[PDB]
JSON list of C-alpha atoms in Angstrom, two decimals:
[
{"chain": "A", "resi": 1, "resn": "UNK", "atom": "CA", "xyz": [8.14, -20.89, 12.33]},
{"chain": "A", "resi": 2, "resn": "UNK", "atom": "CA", "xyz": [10.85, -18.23, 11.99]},
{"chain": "A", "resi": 3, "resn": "UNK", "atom": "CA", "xyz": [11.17, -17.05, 15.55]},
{"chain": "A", "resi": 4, "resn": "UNK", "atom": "CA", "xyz": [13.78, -18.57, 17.30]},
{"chain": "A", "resi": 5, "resn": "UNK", "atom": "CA", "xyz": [13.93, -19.89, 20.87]},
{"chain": "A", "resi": 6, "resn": "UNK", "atom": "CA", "xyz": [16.52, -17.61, 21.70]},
{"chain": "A", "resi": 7, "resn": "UNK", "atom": "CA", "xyz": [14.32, -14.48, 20.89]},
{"chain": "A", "resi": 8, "resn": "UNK", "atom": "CA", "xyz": [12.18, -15.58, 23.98]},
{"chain": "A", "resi": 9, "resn": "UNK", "atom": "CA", "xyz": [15.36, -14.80, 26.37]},
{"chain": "A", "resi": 10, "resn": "UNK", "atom": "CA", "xyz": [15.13, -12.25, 29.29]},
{"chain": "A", "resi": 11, "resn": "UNK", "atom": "CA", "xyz": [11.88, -10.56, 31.32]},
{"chain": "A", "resi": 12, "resn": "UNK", "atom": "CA", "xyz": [8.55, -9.43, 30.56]},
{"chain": "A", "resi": 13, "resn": "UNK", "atom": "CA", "xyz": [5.97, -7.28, 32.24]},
{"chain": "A", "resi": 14, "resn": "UNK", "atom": "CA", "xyz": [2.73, -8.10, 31.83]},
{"chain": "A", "resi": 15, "resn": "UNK", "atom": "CA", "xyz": [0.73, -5.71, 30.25]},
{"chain": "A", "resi": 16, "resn": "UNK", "atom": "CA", "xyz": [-2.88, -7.17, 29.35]},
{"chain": "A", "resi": 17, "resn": "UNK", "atom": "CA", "xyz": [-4.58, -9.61, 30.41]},
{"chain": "A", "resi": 18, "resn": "UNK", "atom": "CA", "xyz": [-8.22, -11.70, 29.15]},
{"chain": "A", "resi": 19, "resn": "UNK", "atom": "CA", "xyz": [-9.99, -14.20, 30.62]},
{"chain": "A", "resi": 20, "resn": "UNK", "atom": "CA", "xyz": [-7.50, -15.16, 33.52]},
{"chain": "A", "resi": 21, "resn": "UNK", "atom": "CA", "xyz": [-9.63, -15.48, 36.64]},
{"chain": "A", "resi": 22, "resn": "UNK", "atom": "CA", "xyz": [-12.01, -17.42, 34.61]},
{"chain": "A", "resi": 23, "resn": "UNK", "atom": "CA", "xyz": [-9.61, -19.77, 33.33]},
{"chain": "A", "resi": 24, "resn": "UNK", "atom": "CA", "xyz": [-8.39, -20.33, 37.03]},
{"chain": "A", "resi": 25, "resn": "UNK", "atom": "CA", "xyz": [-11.95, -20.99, 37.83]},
{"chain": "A", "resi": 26, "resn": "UNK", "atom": "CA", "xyz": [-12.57, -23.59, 34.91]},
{"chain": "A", "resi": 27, "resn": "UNK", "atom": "CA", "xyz": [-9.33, -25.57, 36.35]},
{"chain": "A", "resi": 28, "resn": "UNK", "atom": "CA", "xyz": [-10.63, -25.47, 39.64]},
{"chain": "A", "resi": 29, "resn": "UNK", "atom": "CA", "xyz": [-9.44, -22.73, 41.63]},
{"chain": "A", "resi": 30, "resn": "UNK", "atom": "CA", "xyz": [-10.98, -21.29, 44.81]},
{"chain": "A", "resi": 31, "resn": "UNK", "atom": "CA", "xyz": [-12.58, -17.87, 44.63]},
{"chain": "A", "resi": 32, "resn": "UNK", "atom": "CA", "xyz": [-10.23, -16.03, 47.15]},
{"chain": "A", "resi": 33, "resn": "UNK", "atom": "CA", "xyz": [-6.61, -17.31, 45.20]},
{"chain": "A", "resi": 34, "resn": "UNK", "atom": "CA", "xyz": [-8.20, -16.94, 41.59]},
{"chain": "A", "resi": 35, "resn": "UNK", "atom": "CA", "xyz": [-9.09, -13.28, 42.67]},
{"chain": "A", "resi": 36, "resn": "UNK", "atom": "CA", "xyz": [-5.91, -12.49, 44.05]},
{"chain": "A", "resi": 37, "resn": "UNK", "atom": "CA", "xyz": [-3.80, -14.19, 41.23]},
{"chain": "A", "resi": 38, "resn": "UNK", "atom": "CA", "xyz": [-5.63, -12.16, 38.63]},
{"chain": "A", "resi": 39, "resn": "UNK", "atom": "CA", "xyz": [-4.68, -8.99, 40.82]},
{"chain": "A", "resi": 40, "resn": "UNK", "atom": "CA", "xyz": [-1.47, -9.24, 39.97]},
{"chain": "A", "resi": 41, "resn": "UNK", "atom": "CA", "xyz": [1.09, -7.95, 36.97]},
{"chain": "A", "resi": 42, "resn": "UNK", "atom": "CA", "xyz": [3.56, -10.73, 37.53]},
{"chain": "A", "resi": 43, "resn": "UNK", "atom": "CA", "xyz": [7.14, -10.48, 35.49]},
{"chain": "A", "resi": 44, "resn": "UNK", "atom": "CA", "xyz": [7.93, -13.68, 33.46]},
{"chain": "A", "resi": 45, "resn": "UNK", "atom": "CA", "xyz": [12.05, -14.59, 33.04]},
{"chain": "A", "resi": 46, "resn": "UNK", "atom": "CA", "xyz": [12.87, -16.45, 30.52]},
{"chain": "A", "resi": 47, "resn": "UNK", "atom": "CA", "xyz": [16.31, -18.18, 30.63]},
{"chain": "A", "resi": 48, "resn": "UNK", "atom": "CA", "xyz": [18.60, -21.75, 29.29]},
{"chain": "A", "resi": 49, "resn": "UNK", "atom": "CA", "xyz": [20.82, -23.40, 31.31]},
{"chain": "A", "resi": 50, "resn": "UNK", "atom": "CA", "xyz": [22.72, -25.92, 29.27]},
{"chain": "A", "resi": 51, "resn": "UNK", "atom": "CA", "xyz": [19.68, -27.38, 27.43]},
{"chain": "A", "resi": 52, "resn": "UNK", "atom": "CA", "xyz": [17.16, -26.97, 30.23]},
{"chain": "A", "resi": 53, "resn": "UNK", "atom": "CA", "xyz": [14.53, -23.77, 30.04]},
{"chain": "A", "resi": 54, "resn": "UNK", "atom": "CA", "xyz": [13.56, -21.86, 32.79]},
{"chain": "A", "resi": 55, "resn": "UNK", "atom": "CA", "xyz": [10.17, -20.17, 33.02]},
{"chain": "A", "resi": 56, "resn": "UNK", "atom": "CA", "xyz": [9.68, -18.19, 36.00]},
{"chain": "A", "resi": 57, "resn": "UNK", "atom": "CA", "xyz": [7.28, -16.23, 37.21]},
{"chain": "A", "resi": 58, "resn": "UNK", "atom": "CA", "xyz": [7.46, -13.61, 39.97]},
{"chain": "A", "resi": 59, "resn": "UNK", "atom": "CA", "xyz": [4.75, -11.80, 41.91]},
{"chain": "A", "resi": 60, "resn": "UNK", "atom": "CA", "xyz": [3.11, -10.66, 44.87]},
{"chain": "A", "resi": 61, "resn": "UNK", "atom": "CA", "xyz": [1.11, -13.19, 45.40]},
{"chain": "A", "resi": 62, "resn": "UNK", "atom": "CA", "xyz": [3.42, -16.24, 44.33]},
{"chain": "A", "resi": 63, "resn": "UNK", "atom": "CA", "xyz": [6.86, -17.41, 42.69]},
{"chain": "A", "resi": 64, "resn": "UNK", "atom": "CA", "xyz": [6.15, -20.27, 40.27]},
{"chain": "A", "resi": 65, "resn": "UNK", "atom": "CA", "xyz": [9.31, -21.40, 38.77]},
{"chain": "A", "resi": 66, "resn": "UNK", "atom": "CA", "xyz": [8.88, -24.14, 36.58]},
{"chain": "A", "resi": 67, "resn": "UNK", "atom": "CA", "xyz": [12.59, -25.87, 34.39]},
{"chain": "A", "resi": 68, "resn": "UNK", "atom": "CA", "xyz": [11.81, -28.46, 31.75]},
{"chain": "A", "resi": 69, "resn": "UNK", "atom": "CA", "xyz": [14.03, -30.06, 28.70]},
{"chain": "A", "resi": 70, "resn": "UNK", "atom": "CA", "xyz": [11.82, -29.43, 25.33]},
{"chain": "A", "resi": 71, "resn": "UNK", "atom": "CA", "xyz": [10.10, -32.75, 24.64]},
{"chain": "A", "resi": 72, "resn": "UNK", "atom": "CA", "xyz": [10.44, -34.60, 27.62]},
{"chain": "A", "resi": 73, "resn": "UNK", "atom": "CA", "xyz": [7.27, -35.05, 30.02]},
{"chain": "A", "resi": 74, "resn": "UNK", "atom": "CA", "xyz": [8.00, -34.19, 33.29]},
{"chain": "A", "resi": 75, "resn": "UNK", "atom": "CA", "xyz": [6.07, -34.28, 36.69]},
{"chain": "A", "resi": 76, "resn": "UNK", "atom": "CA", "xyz": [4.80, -30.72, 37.57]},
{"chain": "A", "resi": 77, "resn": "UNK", "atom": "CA", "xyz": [3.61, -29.68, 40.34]},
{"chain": "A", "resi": 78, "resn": "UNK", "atom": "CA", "xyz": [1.71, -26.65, 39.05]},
{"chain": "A", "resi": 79, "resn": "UNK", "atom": "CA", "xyz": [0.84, -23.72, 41.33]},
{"chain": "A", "resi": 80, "resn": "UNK", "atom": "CA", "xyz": [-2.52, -24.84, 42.27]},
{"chain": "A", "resi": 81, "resn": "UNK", "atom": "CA", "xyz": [-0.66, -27.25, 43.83]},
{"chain": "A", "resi": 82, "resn": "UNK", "atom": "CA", "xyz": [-1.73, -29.90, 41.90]},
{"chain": "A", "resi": 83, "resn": "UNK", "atom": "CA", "xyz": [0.57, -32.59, 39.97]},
{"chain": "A", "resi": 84, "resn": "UNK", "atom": "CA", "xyz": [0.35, -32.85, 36.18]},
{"chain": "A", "resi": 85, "resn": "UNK", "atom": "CA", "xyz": [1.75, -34.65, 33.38]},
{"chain": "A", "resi": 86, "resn": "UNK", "atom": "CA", "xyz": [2.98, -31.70, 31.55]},
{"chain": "A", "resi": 87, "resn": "UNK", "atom": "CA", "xyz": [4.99, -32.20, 28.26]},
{"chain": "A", "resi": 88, "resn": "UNK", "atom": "CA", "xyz": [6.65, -28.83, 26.18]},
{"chain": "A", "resi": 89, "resn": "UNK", "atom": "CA", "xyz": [7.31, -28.63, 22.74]},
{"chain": "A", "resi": 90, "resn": "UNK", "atom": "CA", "xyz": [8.34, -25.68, 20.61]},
{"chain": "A", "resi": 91, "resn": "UNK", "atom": "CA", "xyz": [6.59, -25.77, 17.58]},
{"chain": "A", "resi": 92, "resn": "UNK", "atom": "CA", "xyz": [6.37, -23.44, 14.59]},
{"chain": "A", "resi": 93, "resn": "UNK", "atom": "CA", "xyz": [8.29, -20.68, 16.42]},
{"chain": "A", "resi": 94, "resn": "UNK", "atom": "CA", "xyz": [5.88, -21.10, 20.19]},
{"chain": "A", "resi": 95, "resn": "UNK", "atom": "CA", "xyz": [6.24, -22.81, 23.21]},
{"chain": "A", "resi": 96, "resn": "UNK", "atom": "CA", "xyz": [3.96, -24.84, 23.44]},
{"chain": "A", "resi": 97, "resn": "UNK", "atom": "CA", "xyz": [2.82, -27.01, 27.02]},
{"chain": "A", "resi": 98, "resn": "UNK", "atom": "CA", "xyz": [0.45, -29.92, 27.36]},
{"chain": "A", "resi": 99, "resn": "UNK", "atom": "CA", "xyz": [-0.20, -29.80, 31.25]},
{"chain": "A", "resi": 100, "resn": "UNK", "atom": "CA", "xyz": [-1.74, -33.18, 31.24]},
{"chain": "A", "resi": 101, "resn": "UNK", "atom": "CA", "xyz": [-3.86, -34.18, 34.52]},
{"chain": "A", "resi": 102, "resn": "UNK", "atom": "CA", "xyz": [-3.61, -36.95, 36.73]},
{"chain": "A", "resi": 103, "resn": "UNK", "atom": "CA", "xyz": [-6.64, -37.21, 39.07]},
{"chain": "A", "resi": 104, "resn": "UNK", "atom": "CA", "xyz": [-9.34, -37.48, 36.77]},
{"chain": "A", "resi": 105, "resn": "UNK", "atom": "CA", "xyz": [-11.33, -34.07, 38.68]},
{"chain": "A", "resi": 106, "resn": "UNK", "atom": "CA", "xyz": [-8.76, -31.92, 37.76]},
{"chain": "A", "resi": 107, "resn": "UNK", "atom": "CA", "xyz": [-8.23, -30.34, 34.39]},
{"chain": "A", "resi": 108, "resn": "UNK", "atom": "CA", "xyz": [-6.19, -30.31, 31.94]},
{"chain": "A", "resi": 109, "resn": "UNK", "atom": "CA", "xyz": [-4.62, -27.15, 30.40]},
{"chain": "A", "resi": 110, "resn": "UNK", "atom": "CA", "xyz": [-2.55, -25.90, 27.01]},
{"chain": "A", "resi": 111, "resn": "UNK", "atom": "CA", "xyz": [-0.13, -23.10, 27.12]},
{"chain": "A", "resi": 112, "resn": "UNK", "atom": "CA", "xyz": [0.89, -21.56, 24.33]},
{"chain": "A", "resi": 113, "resn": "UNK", "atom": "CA", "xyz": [4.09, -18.45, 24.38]},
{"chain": "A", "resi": 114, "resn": "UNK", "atom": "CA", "xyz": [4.78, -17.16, 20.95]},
{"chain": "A", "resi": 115, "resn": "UNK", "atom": "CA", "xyz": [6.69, -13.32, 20.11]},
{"chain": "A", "resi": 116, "resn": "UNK", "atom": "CA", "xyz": [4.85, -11.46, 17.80]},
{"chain": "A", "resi": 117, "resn": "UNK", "atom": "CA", "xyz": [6.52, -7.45, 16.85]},
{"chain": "A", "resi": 118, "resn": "UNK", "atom": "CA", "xyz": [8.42, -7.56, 20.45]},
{"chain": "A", "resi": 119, "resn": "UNK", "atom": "CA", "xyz": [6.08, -8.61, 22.34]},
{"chain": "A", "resi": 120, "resn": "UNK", "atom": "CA", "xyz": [5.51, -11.42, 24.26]},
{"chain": "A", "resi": 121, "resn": "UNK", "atom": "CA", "xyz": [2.01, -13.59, 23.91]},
{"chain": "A", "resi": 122, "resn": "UNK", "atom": "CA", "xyz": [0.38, -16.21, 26.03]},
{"chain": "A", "resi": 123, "resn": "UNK", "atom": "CA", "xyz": [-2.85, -18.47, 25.94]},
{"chain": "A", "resi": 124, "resn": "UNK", "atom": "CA", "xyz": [-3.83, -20.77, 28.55]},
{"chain": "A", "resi": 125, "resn": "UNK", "atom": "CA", "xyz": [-6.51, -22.86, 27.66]},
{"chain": "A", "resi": 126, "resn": "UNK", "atom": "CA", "xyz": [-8.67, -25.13, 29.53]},
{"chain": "A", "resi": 127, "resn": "UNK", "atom": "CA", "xyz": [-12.68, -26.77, 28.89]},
{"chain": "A", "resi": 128, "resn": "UNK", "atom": "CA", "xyz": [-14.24, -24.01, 27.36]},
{"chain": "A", "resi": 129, "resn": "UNK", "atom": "CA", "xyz": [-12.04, -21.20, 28.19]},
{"chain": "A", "resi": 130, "resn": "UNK", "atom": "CA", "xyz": [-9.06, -19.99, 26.93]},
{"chain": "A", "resi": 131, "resn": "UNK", "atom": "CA", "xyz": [-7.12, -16.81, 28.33]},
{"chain": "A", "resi": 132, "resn": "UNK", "atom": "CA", "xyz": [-5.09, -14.34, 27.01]},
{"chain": "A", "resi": 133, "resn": "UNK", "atom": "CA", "xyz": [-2.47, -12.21, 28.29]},
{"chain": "A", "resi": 134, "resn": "UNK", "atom": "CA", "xyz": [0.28, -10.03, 26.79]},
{"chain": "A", "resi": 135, "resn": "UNK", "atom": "CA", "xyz": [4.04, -8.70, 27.66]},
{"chain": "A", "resi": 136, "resn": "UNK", "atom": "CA", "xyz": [6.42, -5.89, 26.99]},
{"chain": "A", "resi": 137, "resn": "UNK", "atom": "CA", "xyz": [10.54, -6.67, 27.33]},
{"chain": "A", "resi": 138, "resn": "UNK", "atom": "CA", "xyz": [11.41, -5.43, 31.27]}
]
């Protein structure tokens, strides 16, 4: 619970990565985007504005900019193009989102960002399957 939401500030590479394609398969991705996605090293920025986050993503294959307020649900639309329910907290020093469907075939997800020595760590977790990937500071 020590880390501090400030520490997550600024860009990371992606540097390892577990489990991704098969998490975009349990939530219901096609074949051709789930391959491509997991192609990619995307960079992750990290910024506030005021009191609302920033999380975006940047790659080859897509942008996926998502802002939220901490603790207040918020439509989504996700970049399977689906809408979700999606809620953040930060919790014991992680970010932590509850990506809550709405159409009962879809599939609901946790995300969970947390630092650990200067890095930066992500699960996404879905049904059986969680993934995990790891970043280093840009």
């Amino acid at each position: 619970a020590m880390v501090s939401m400030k520490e997550f500030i600024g860009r990371w590479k992606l540097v390892h990565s577990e489990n991704f394609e098969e998490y975009l398969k349990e939530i219901g991705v096609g074949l051709l985007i789930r391959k491509a996605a997991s192609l990619t090293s995307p960079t992750l920025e990290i910024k506030l504005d005021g009191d609302t986050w920033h999380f975006n993503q940047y790659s080859t294959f897509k942008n996926n900019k998502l802002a939220f307020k901490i603790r207040e649900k918020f439509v989504e639309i996700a970049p399977d193009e689906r809408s979700y329910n999606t809620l953040v907290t930060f919790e014991n020093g992680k970010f932590i989102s509850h990506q809550d469907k709405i159409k009962e075939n879809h599939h609901s997800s946790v995300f969970t960002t947390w630092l650990e020595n200067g890095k930066l760590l992500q699960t996404y977790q879905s049904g059986s399957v969680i993934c995990r990937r790891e970043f280093v500071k840009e």
